[PDB]
């Protein structure tokens, strides 16, 4: 609809497409099976955000109902977008930067914004896998290292911050991270973490070495395994003590939370991360298929499994939170029992849980001034089920504490950390496909130097930039970039893909070309959401961002062991030079989409 000239003789033509696949068998890779393509697309949508990000948002935002919100927004943003992304790579036969430079070559910023976004997400997601395989190496020993406090020098008492905090909370901040008190104070490289980082990048270079003919078998294993383990964790989780008391708590509807501008944003920004939209990897994976492959049936099957898995991991996660909260309620209520037995001389099995409150008043009516020194607790469930931990603590200080109280402790910890590893790995494959393929269409290296050499300089180049998160303050740097980065770029890049296919390429040329592949020109549901609904629905997510950014009082959490009233929380209000980092990681992937479009329109004219 927008007047771009010369669209033909820049893209392949429709009558020429039946001859192009019997010559792109050379000089272009190809899938072996159809299941090799669906398993590497499920692994790119499902990873590490269904574990510690979705089940918190499913409950904290009026769970049981948030399902509703998350659903609608899905079959509205997600479906339409994913479909249009699968059908644009199969037709134009290029990667991510080659598709948007084929249609109006003055655009070209959507390819460079997808490469900068895939570089920054895959930079810090390879440090989370670095932390995960550190907890995997510290398995294979029956007293796990996060099970008991160490002794200090004289072997008479514990270490001081292991006694005020928890031993698990001590293994993360002092024996894994060696964290500092601020983001300003940084130290050395912390060798162990560095070795682990090396291992992670090395394991990543072995799987994605020769492009797509290695990540095939890789995807197979790294895509099934995760599922089987997740299952095994369901029939163990639903048996322990306190599951079905953490499943009910997840699915309690609170309809007041639906009328909130902050609910529909993170429900909207999870859909763009429950899938892998606006990343540039799903277009490069779809471009290897046959020309008559059904891409309408693939986008429904991929989105049904992604909507079913996000509920399925939340059942497994909140079964373990329900077991940990029932255990902490019983090891609290047995100490309120133990106080009066040690003060009023009663038999052992005397004064259980059924008779606590009536035996409170039998003692104070027997003899006063002996109840006044008694310290009791006000501990109760829905206060042990209601901690707001999120993002890394749901696996390193919450899930791994409930594993130590199970029967076979060093076996449920090996099975738990190899699964997370697998998830991370599949996501990594995705992001790597995202940064290598646009770096070949730019031709930064000569057409010598085969596929082993370009991937080796990406895995070694992103390794040296990953030294930031190995410092003492390296966990404050990783909690900074994540959110911001992701969110902003994702939304913005996602809007201009829906715009430049419908109004620059033309939705009438699109329909014809699609029909040429499958038959049966798409329904009234596809024509409505492509044209009016999903571009409008992606603007109110972009409008709600600058509503919740201007009033949330941007802060961050520190540890600070030498601090009065220590183990509660802390928020100490980021320094003024950190806005340089926020502008850099969130702004310049957003600004290369207009920035190249202004440069190309003034170089010619």
């Amino acid at each position: 609809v927008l007047p771009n000239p010369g669209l033909d003789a820049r893209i392949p033509s429709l009558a020429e497409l039946e001859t192009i696949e019997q010559e792109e068998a050379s000089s272009r890779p190809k899938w072996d099976n159809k299941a090799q393509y669906m398993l590497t697309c499920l692994g790119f949508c499902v990873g590490l955000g269904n574990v510690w990000r979705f089940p918190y948002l499913c409950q904290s935002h009026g769970g049981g109902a948030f399902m509703i919100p998350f659903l609608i927004l899905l079959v509205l943003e997600g479906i339409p977008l994913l479909y249009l992304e699968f059908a644009i790579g199969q037709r134009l036969r290029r990667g991510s930067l080659g598709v948007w430079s084929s249609i109006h070559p003055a655009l070209k910023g959507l390819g460079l914004a997808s490469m900068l976004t895939s570089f920054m997400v895959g930079l810090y997601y390879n440090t989370i896998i670095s932390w995960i395989m550190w907890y995997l190496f510290n398995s294979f020993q029956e007293p796990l290292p996060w099970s008991d406090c160490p002794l200090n020098e004289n072997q008479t008492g514990y270490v001081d911050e292991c006694a005020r905090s928890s031993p698990v909370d001590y293994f993360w901040y002092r024996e894994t991270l060696n964290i500092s008190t601020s983001i300003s104070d940084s130290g050395s490289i912390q060798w162990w973490m560095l070795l682990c980082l090396a291992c992670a990048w090395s394991v990543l270079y072995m799987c994605t070495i020769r492009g797509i003919e290695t990540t095939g078998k890789a995807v197979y294993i790294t895509s099934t395994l995760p599922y089987v383990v997740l299952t095994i964790f369901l029939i163990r989780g639903l048996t322990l003590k306190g599951a079905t008391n953490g499943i009910v708590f997840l699915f309690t509807p609170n309809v007041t939370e639906l009328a909130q501008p902050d609910t529909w944003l993170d429900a909207g920004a999870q859909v763009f991360f429950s899938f892998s939209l606006a990343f540039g990897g799903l277009i490069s994976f779809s471009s290897y298929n046959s020309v008559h492959n059904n891409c309408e049936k693939d986008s429904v099957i991929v989105s049904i499994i992604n909507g079913f898995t996000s509920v399925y991991v939340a059942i497994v996660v909140y079964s373990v939170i329900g077991f940990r909260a029932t255990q902490r309620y019983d090891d609290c209520f047995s100490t309120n029992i133990l106080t009066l037995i040690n003060g009023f001389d009663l038999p052992e099995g005397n004064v259980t849980q059924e008779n606590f409150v009536d035996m409170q008043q039998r003692c104070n009516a027997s003899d006063p001034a002996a109840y006044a020194q008694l310290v009791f607790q006000t501990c109760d469930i829905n206060a042990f089920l209601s901690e707001a931990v999120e993002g890394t603590g749901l696996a390193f200080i919450v899930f791994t504490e409930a594993i130590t109280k199970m029967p076979l402790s060093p076996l449920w910890s090996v099975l738990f950390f190899i699964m997370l590893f697998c998830l991370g790995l599949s996501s990594m494959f995705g992001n790597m496909e995202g940064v290598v393929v646009p770096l070949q269409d730019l031709r930064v290296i000569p057409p010598k130097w085969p596929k082993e050499v370009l991937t080796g300089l990406i895995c070694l180049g992103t390794f040296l930039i990953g030294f930031i998160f190995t410092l003492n303050s390296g966990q404050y740097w990783l909690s900074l970039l994540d959110s911001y980065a992701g969110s902003i770029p994702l939304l913005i890049i996602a809007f201009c893909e829906m715009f430049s296919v419908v109004y620059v390429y033309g939705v009438d040329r699109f329909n014809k070309d699609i029909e040429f592949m499958i038959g049966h020109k798409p329904n009234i549901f596809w024509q409505v959401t492509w044209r009016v609904v999903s571009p409008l629905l992606m603007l109110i997510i972009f409008l709600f961002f600058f509503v919740v950014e201007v009033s949330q009082e941007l802060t961050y959490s520190i540890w600070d062991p030498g601090y009065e009233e220590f183990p509660k929380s802390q928020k100490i209000s980021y320094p003024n030079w950190v806005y340089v980092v926020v502008v850099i990681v969130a702004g310049v992937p957003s600004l290369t989409i207009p920035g190249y479009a202004i440069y190309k329109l003034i170089r010619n004219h």
């Binding site: 550190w134 995997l136 190496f137 510290n138 398995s139 294979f140 020993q141 070795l195 682990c196 291992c199 090395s202 394991v203 270079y205 072995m206 070495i209 020769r210 290695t214 085969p450 082993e452």
Partner: peptide, 30 residues
């Protein structure tokens, strides 16, 4: 022994051997 160092050890071994068996199969495809 510092038991996490031997697991890491064994894993690194395999990783490296694999990368090598991977860069020499790619020279037997010319």
């Amino acid at each position: 022994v510092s038991i996490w160092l031997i697991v890491f050890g064994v894993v690194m071994g395999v990783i490296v051997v694999g990368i090598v068996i991977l860069i020499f199969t790619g020279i037997r495809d010319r």
